[PDB]
Design an enzyme around this catalytic site. Sequence first.
Site, PDB file in Angstrom:
ATOM      1  N   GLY B 148       0.821  -1.197   0.000  1.00  0.00           N
ATOM      2  CA  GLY B 148       0.000   0.000   0.000  1.00  0.00           C
ATOM      3  C   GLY B 148       0.863   1.259   0.000  1.00  0.00           C
ATOM      4  O   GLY B 148       0.552   2.241  -0.674  1.00  0.00           O
ATOM      5  N   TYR B 154      10.035   2.830   2.095  1.00  0.00           N
ATOM      6  CA  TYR B 154      10.838   1.645   2.360  1.00  0.00           C
ATOM      7  C   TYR B 154      12.275   1.826   1.867  1.00  0.00           C
ATOM      8  O   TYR B 154      12.997   0.848   1.707  1.00  0.00           O
ATOM      9  CB  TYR B 154      10.190   0.429   1.687  1.00  0.00           C
ATOM     10  CG  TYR B 154       8.869  -0.013   2.267  1.00  0.00           C
ATOM     11  CD1 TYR B 154       8.809  -0.692   3.473  1.00  0.00           C
ATOM     12  CD2 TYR B 154       7.677   0.231   1.602  1.00  0.00           C
ATOM     13  CE1 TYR B 154       7.604  -1.116   4.005  1.00  0.00           C
ATOM     14  CE2 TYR B 154       6.463  -0.190   2.117  1.00  0.00           C
ATOM     15  CZ  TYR B 154       6.429  -0.866   3.323  1.00  0.00           C
ATOM     16  OH  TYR B 154       5.238  -1.283   3.850  1.00  0.00           O
ATOM     17  N   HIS B 160       9.627   3.654   7.260  1.00  0.00           N
ATOM     18  CA  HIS B 160       9.529   2.237   7.589  1.00  0.00           C
ATOM     19  C   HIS B 160      10.906   1.582   7.659  1.00  0.00           C
ATOM     20  O   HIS B 160      11.075   0.576   8.351  1.00  0.00           O
ATOM     21  CB  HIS B 160       8.676   1.467   6.574  1.00  0.00           C
ATOM     22  CG  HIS B 160       7.221   1.803   6.603  1.00  0.00           C
ATOM     23  ND1 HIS B 160       6.534   2.124   7.754  1.00  0.00           N
ATOM     24  CD2 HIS B 160       6.328   1.882   5.606  1.00  0.00           C
ATOM     25  CE1 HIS B 160       5.270   2.375   7.453  1.00  0.00           C
ATOM     26  NE2 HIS B 160       5.121   2.228   6.156  1.00  0.00           N
TER      27      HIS B 160
HETATM   28  C1  LIG Z   1      -3.718  -6.758   7.472  1.00  0.00           C
HETATM   29  C2  LIG Z   1      -3.036  -5.900   6.438  1.00  0.00           C
HETATM   30  C3  LIG Z   1      -1.742  -5.483   6.640  1.00  0.00           C
HETATM   31  C4  LIG Z   1      -1.072  -4.682   5.698  1.00  0.00           C
HETATM   32  N1  LIG Z   1       0.217  -4.310   5.968  1.00  0.00           N
HETATM   33  C5  LIG Z   1       0.826  -3.561   5.087  1.00  0.00           C
HETATM   34  C6  LIG Z   1       2.165  -3.158   5.332  1.00  0.00           C
HETATM   35  O1  LIG Z   1       2.784  -3.483   6.339  1.00  0.00           O
HETATM   36  N2  LIG Z   1       2.776  -2.375   4.379  1.00  0.00           N
HETATM   37  C7  LIG Z   1       2.136  -1.995   3.232  1.00  0.00           C
HETATM   38  O2  LIG Z   1       2.763  -1.297   2.432  1.00  0.00           O
HETATM   39  N3  LIG Z   1       0.868  -2.358   2.972  1.00  0.00           N
HETATM   40  C8  LIG Z   1       0.239  -3.104   3.856  1.00  0.00           C
HETATM   41  N4  LIG Z   1      -1.058  -3.495   3.612  1.00  0.00           N
HETATM   42  C9  LIG Z   1      -1.703  -3.086   2.349  1.00  0.00           C
HETATM   43  C10 LIG Z   1      -1.592  -4.175   1.282  1.00  0.00           C
HETATM   44  O3  LIG Z   1      -0.220  -4.524   1.088  1.00  0.00           O
HETATM   45  C11 LIG Z   1      -2.219  -3.744  -0.048  1.00  0.00           C
HETATM   46  O4  LIG Z   1      -3.617  -3.542   0.100  1.00  0.00           O
HETATM   47  C12 LIG Z   1      -2.035  -4.753  -1.178  1.00  0.00           C
HETATM   48  O5  LIG Z   1      -0.640  -4.994  -1.375  1.00  0.00           O
HETATM   49  C13 LIG Z   1      -2.661  -4.280  -2.469  1.00  0.00           C
HETATM   50  O6  LIG Z   1      -2.838  -5.408  -3.368  1.00  0.00           O
HETATM   51  P1  LIG Z   1      -4.322  -5.829  -3.813  1.00  0.00           P
HETATM   52  O7  LIG Z   1      -4.177  -6.858  -4.885  1.00  0.00           O
HETATM   53  O8  LIG Z   1      -5.134  -6.151  -2.596  1.00  0.00           O
HETATM   54  O9  LIG Z   1      -4.917  -4.468  -4.446  1.00  0.00           O
HETATM   55  P2  LIG Z   1      -6.317  -4.070  -5.147  1.00  0.00           P
HETATM   56  O10 LIG Z   1      -6.840  -2.782  -4.602  1.00  0.00           O
HETATM   57  O11 LIG Z   1      -7.241  -5.243  -5.110  1.00  0.00           O
HETATM   58  O12 LIG Z   1      -5.836  -3.837  -6.664  1.00  0.00           O
HETATM   59  C14 LIG Z   1      -5.170  -2.595  -7.029  1.00  0.00           C
HETATM   60  C15 LIG Z   1      -5.885  -1.929  -8.183  1.00  0.00           C
HETATM   61  O13 LIG Z   1      -5.676  -2.711  -9.384  1.00  0.00           O
HETATM   62  C16 LIG Z   1      -6.910  -2.918 -10.021  1.00  0.00           C
HETATM   63  N5  LIG Z   1      -6.817  -4.118 -10.813  1.00  0.00           N
HETATM   64  C17 LIG Z   1      -7.173  -5.396 -10.476  1.00  0.00           C
HETATM   65  N6  LIG Z   1      -6.954  -6.249 -11.452  1.00  0.00           N
HETATM   66  C18 LIG Z   1      -6.432  -5.480 -12.484  1.00  0.00           C
HETATM   67  C19 LIG Z   1      -6.000  -5.794 -13.786  1.00  0.00           C
HETATM   68  N7  LIG Z   1      -6.039  -7.023 -14.294  1.00  0.00           N
HETATM   69  N8  LIG Z   1      -5.527  -4.779 -14.554  1.00  0.00           N
HETATM   70  C20 LIG Z   1      -5.510  -3.542 -14.039  1.00  0.00           C
HETATM   71  N9  LIG Z   1      -5.891  -3.129 -12.833  1.00  0.00           N
HETATM   72  C21 LIG Z   1      -6.343  -4.162 -12.097  1.00  0.00           C
HETATM   73  C22 LIG Z   1      -7.931  -2.948  -8.896  1.00  0.00           C
HETATM   74  O14 LIG Z   1      -9.235  -2.747  -9.393  1.00  0.00           O
HETATM   75  C23 LIG Z   1      -7.411  -1.777  -8.059  1.00  0.00           C
HETATM   76  O15 LIG Z   1      -7.842  -0.544  -8.617  1.00  0.00           O
HETATM   77  C24 LIG Z   1      -1.738  -4.298   4.520  1.00  0.00           C
HETATM   78  C25 LIG Z   1      -3.059  -4.726   4.318  1.00  0.00           C
HETATM   79  C26 LIG Z   1      -3.707  -5.516   5.241  1.00  0.00           C
HETATM   80  C27 LIG Z   1      -5.124  -5.951   4.966  1.00  0.00           C
END
Ligand SMILES: Cc1cc2nc3c(=O)[nH]c(=O)nc-3n(C[C@H](O)[C@H](O)[C@H](O)COP(=O)(O)OP(=O)(O)OC[C@H]3O[C@@H](n4cnc5c(N)ncnc54)[C@H](O)[C@@H]3O)c2cc1C
Lengths: 272, 271
Positions: B148, B154, B160
């Site tokens: 995120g 980083y 971080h």
């Molecule tokens: C418990 C927890 C702990 C976390 N800890 C951390 C941390 O320590 N450090 C940190 O940096 N983050 C942290 N996060 C955040 C997390 O790393 C991010 O939410 C995650 O990496 C994002 O990936 P995603 O696939 O879920 O994203 P999504 O939001 O599902 O996808 C990103 C975007 O891409 C789009 N997309 C999907 N498929 C396609 C496609 N085929 N082509 C184009 N676009 C597309 C989606 O619609 C969206 O707009 C944490 C989250 C949680 C829940």
Amino acid sequence: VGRRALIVLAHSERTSFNYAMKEAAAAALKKKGWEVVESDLYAMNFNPIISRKDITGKLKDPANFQYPAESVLAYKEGHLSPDIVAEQKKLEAADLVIFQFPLQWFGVPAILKGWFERVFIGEFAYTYAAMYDKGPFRSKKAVLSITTGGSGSMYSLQGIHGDMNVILWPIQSGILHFCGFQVLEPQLTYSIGHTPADARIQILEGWKKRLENIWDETPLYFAPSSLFDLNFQAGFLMKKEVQDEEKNKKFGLSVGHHLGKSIPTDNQIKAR
Amino acid sequence: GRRALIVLAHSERTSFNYAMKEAAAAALKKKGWEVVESDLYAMNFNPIISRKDITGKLKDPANFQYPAESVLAYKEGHLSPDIVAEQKKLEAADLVIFQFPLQWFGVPAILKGWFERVFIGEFAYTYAAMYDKGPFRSKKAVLSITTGGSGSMYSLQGIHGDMNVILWPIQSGILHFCGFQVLEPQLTYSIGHTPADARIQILEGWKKRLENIWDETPLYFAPSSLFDLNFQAGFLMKKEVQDEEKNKKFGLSVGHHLGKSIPTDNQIKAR
Ligand SMILES: Cc1cc2nc3c(=O)[nH]c(=O)nc-3n(C[C@H](O)[C@H](O)[C@H](O)COP(=O)(O)OP(=O)(O)OC[C@H]3O[C@@H](n4cnc5c(N)ncnc54)[C@H](O)[C@@H]3O)c2cc1C
Ligand SMILES: Cc1cc2nc3c(=O)[nH]c(=O)nc-3n(C[C@H](O)[C@H](O)[C@H](O)COP(=O)(O)OP(=O)(O)OC[C@H]3O[C@@H](n4cnc5c(N)ncnc54)[C@H](O)[C@@H]3O)c2cc1C
């Protein structure tokens, strides 16, 4: 009155030394007049998997489910799963948090990892404005009590596994300090499997002794957030004036903020 | 024709992590790989080590120790079939891709559990055969991670702290420990704030890299040959090697920094 302590235990067996360390902690703390709540995660059949089931209300966008955003909404409007909330209240109440667990694959057991994932929700445990030393749990103190199968030599600077300080960093900084905890010197019990019974009893008494003055201890050094420009813009980078001050120094600030230099000895293990 | 295992830890098919899995399989299939998947959420995979992982008789049920009991179950072959099915995928696979979002500075709990239940002794490691001598030294592994937070956060001067420190316990402690050659991680920063056209770029970039993934140089870990591998010496670095390194300005790796500077991007870029 008295302060309040939460012991979080991640071990399935009541016969284990980890269980024995939990009991010793509760006993010792109770006798000094603490109130002690437990989260024995295995005993509770605690669920470690984040999912849609964690929100018991309407999702904002069920077609595009994002745990971060949905979970924060659920916290604010108060339709989180009750198992999450019950744990959140223990934490709200607790002044000291002890994490008792065996080291598994250079980290916390999966069940404890899941606890962090489900319980440390946004707005409850962290924002974005309020990270690290400004976070919600800056009134509270936390301590890792860990056991290993491997001896301490293995985790020394010249050990096969490498520095234990590097291993603790992601947990103590990335999880605990991130949310605001003052992190106390970890209780490291090495090569427990090869330790005779008389020596284990010693370690238990050693643990109990420490807990009598735990609150007065000096916490570990993390780089203060005041050394960084805390906004999206500067990119949460260290201030230019602070980079200039540190340029001449031989040592870095912490394990993560080593700044390409030497890491202060036992940064994550001993307090300055 | 080689085999690949893609391990995915994300609940949503709508995620970028799923998109990155699909792109990997497509790209690899087109070059004539066989691709098996472990979509841990879609499998409803169980991450909790327990007695139930052994389906036979315990050696000592009064005093249950998962390390010892799980090794006996492996050898005599009464492990839970869910564990074994995954172990077969690994035995077969030449390349293993781990696709997951960074959660709390590490792997998601479900993937952590996978490592805990599947990487059993004798199968994945002994302590006669650790690190470069381990069972999976013929195989290659690669983390594909999403965050995120932005990359600046980083960096060496980021709030971080160094990403190299974060990856170390995973890439060294889990992967290399068992023998894997670890390839440069695929780090996709601040994915939620990336525009649609740039995400398409990242996917195409991932696919391109995978066409020549096998030929890549792996990350540097201190060879086990630098250490005395027995209980007595305490698995310490050899005295002669300590003398060699005394004059050098840099350490060997992130974990073997030796109180000196860490070689730049030790856990991110290959020698
Ligand atoms: C418990 C927890 C702990 C976390 N800890 C951390 C941390 O320590 N450090 C940190 O940096 N983050 C942290 N996060 C955040 C997390 O790393 C991010 O939410 C995650 O990496 C994002 O990936 P995603 O696939 O879920 O994203 P999504 O939001 O599902 O996808 C990103 C975007 O891409 C789009 N997309 C999907 N498929 C396609 C496609 N085929 N082509 C184009 N676009 C597309 C989606 O619609 C969206 O707009 C944490 C989250 C949680 C829940
Ligand atoms: C998946 C997995 C990953 C692992 N990864 C690592 C790793 O990366 N690095 C590493 O170093 N190790 C690793 N280990 C090993 C692990 O650290 C040890 O198994 C664990 O630390 C042992 O702690 P315990 O409490 O279970 O000990 P136990 O074996 O349960 O306890 C030690 C002894 O104390 C006895 N005892 C219990 N209660 C008392 C009492 N009240 N008084 C006196 N004696 C008592 C017990 O009967 C036993 O004989 C891993 C293990 C697993 C299963």
